[PDB]
Amino acid sequence: TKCPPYIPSRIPFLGHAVAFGKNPIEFLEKAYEKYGPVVSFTMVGKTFTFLLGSDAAALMFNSKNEDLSAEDVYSKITTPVFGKGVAYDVPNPIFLEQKKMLKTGLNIAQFKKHVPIIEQETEEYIKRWGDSGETNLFVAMSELIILTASSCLHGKEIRSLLNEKVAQLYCDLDGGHEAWLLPSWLPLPSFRRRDRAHREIKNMFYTAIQKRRTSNEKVDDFLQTLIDATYKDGHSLSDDEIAGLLIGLLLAGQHTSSTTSSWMSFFLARDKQLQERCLAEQKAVCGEDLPPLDFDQLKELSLLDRCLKETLRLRPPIMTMMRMARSPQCVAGYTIPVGHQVCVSPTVNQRLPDSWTERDEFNPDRYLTDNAATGEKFAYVPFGAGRHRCIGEGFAYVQLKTILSTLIRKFEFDLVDGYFPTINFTTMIHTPNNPVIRYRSRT
Ligand code: HEM
């Protein structure tokens, strides 16, 4: 019973709901100062124990689901979203069976095919912009990412079936507490047409899937990985299971990729020098005529890579990873009891003053010298770390770098009247005047 420091509260049940909810990052920064790397506090009935800093976060990253449980906090968040027999509604071994099926289909051989497809979808979409004007970038990315992701993981049959009609039918699907995401100004009807997309979208897949079943167009696309995929008991995945796995893979990468793409642009629309140094790198690595991209070139676009890593450092779309303690855990000379909701914050760890120089500046060149991203284990964890890591990370870098390149080539970006959008935790539904960006064609 040697429990970590616990921040007390004068408000019985809500605890620190207001203080924390007002600014979670500032709250936790202050808590690390006052209380150390492992602190507890009550919020709306639950005791939360945060692991702050790399050395404390090591507990969760090196943990097993039998001790720190995701299916005890992340299951009824996701199950109404992804479906039955898929995601956190199945036993971990068969859960991890499908995850190993997904990770096989997300390989370099496919990433080489994916880079062309992403550019075509970007070129036909961003033509809507025309010559010059101003767009809502968060909304712009939301729509583009759906198309790009759909035309890579779902196939061409399902892309053919896709129209501007269904793009927001994912929004009601997205609605269904859902994950500690960074708040953003994406289209937020959330309700849209609940219960209706579940029929529309699911049957969109059944039909497309049957075209691949009774036919001999066995191709190398992600869907053909799942149709031919067999469990380790021989039985292959059913019709509804394959659809659930594909729907869920586009949703887990939607807001994440969209929010990051937008923030990086805003960060580059603020610093015009870096936006030029990037364009230099583009025509210098690919040639001045800007020929179509391919996987290989992406690996040497290092400035873009360091801008993306710096974006993910300051604006990680997953704000907090959470687990429920089923067995007592030991960290920093403390024992976390059964029933605590153990939390790691990539945002905090990637901002901690005792680990990052110029913590709040968007400085991509910090990776050219020493930094915590390589010099520490769990100080830079946008995609997670260790045993708990994003399987879409490889597709993410490919998708994001291809998209941003296709943008920085065909456009230049700047802030409208100098407006740089800020995240507000105090505005429940009343966002401050929406985020807009300025675009103008190149040359
Ligand atoms: C900037 C982009 C992204 C970030 C920062 C991100 C972040 C994360 C993180 C931190 C996790 C671990 C959550 C946890 O263990 O509690 C995760 C899991 C996952 N992500 Fe992402 N992700 C991104 C993009 C994507 C993409 C593009 C896909 C799919 C194409 C995707 C699919 C998944 C899936 C399937 C999981 C599995 C959840 C599990 O392990 O049980 N994500 N992501």
Numbering used by the authors: 58 to 233, 236 to 502
Structure paper excerpt:
Sterol 14α-demethylases (CYP51s) represent a very special P450 family, regarded as a possible evolutionary progenitor for all currently existing P450s. In metazoans CYP51 is critical for the biosynthesis of sterols including cholesterol. Binding of physiological substrates, however, causes a conserved conformational switch that involves closing of the active site entrance (bordered by helices A’, F’’ and the tip of the β4 hairpin).
Here we report the first crystal structure of a non-mammalian vertebrate CYP51, from the abyssal grenadier (Coryphaenoides armatus), a deep-sea fish common in most oceans of the world at depths between one and five kilometers. The structural similarities that we find distinguishing for both ligand-free vertebrate CYP51s include the “broken I-helix” (residues 311–313), and the “heme bulge” segment (residues 441–450) shifted away from the P450 heme. The shifted heme bulge segment in the ligand-free C. armatus and human CYP51 structures is accompanied by the loss of the conserved heme-supporting salt bridge between the imidazole nitrogen of H447 and the carboxylate oxygen of the porphyrin ring D propionate. Instead, this region of the molecule adopts a loop-like conformation and is immersed deep inside the active site pocket, approaching helix I (SRS4), strand β1–4 (SRS5), and “clashing” with the β4 hairpin (SRS6) in the superimposed human CYP51 structure. In turn, the C. armatus CYP51 β4 hairpin is moved outward, away from the active site, protruding above the surface of the protein globule. The distance between the C. armatus P242 and the corresponding proline (ending the F” helix in the human structure) is 24 Å, and the tips of their β4 hairpins (I488) are 16 Å apart (inset). Instead, it is a transient, low-populated conformation common to all CYP51s, which becomes more populated due to the placement of the high-pressure adapted enzyme at ambient conditions.
